[PDB]
């Protein structure tokens, strides 16, 4: 009942900002708590943040991520967002969007984020 597509990723420089978006094609988005996870080279997929159905509550993996990342949603646009500031090279990863409601879990295919200190310099 859900087809999530992430976008907004790409090649960026250290210290820069980036805003991911994740869109459902359907029209029951507000049934779902939404989440962002990320998976870096040869590492486990890790939690970043989640947001309640109405967007009143949100949760971060830890205060380092909370310090620089903001999860939000716009139920009218069937979209969840991830604002990422002061990006580090260590933020490099495929970012995945994740929807949950009751016993149903849905995932997108992910969007690549590459943060490099040296590329371009």
């Amino acid at each position: 009942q859900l087809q999530l597509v992430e976008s907004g990723g790409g090649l960026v420089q250290a210290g820069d900002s980036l805003k991911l978006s994740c869109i459902d094609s359907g029209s029951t988005f507000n049934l779902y708590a939404m989440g962002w996870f990320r998976q870096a080279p040869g590492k486990e997929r890790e939690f970043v943040a989640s947001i309640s159905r109405g967007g009143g509550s949100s949760y971060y993996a830890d205060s380092q991520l909370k310090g620089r990342f903001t999860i939000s949603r716009d139920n009218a646009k069937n979209t969840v967002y991830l604002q990422m500031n002061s990006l580090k090279p260590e933020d490099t990863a495929v970012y995945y969007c994740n929807a949950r409601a009751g016993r149903y879990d849905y995932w997108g295919q992910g969007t690549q984020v590459t943060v490099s200190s040296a590329a371009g310099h």
């Binding site: 250290a14 080279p41 040869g42 090279p89 590459t114 490099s116 200190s117 040296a118 590329a119 310099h121």
Partner: protein, 205 residues
């Protein structure tokens, strides 16, 4: 012998006398010892017309050490900024842009999709101790390597694990078939010097 780069500058460096052919695969090995602690900087770089970041190994300031090929990046699992001598080998292949990182004879990781299908452009300049922003120049002191370098060699294939062990162990001394570490292939400039190097065992003490 070793090359000595004693101070963070934009004017002292080594220069490999030979250029590179067009490479569909390579192995680059070297011994290094870095004094500098916010990052080892740039032990070597390869620049061509069109692309000054054609091959670069750089740990810039407090950032993860990166390999650039054609200005495309991978973070490597090298941990060599401890002020001790270490041996490293990097292998790479055009095919699927697959790389491997070896430290002291041990394979610490691999990755894919680094400049896949890009052959390395021939004819460029290999600089020791500096990062290039033009062919052979436009160095940046904040990116410079400070310390010592030895036994920098380049082959045009992916060496096998066992060959790397023997090189790391210095139980082999076979020179790079493309870039050999010999006196007349390594020019120094601006204060950089060359000196007899301790044996492999003396180093790791």
């Amino acid at each position: 012998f070793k090359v000595s780069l004693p101070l963070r500058t934009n004017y002292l460096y080594g220069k490999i006398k030979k250029t590179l052919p067009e490479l569909y695969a390579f192995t680059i090995c070297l011994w290094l010892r870095s004094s500098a602690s916010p990052g080892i900087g740039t032990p070597f770089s390869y620049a061509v017309p069109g692309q000054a970041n054609e091959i670069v190994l750089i740990e810039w300031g407090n950032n993860p050490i990166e390999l650039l090929i054609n200005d495309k990046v991978a973070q490597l699992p090298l941990f060599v900024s401890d002020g001790k001598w270490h041996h490293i080998c990097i292998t790479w292949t055009t095919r699927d842009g697959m790389w491997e990182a070896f430290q002291d004879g041990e394979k610490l990781g691999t990755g894919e999709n680094l400049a896949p299908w890009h052959p390395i452009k021939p004819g460029g300049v290999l600089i020791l101790g500096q990062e290039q922003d033009t062919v052979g120049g436009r160095f940046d002191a904040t990116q410079a390597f400070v310390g010592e370098l030895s036994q920098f060699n380049i082959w045009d294939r992916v060496l096998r694990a066992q060959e790397i062990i023997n090189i790391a162990n210095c139980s082999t001394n076979m020179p790079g078939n493309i870039i050999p570490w010999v006196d007349n292939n390594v020019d120094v400039f601006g204060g950089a010097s060359k000196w007899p190097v301790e044996t492999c065992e003396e180093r790791l003490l």
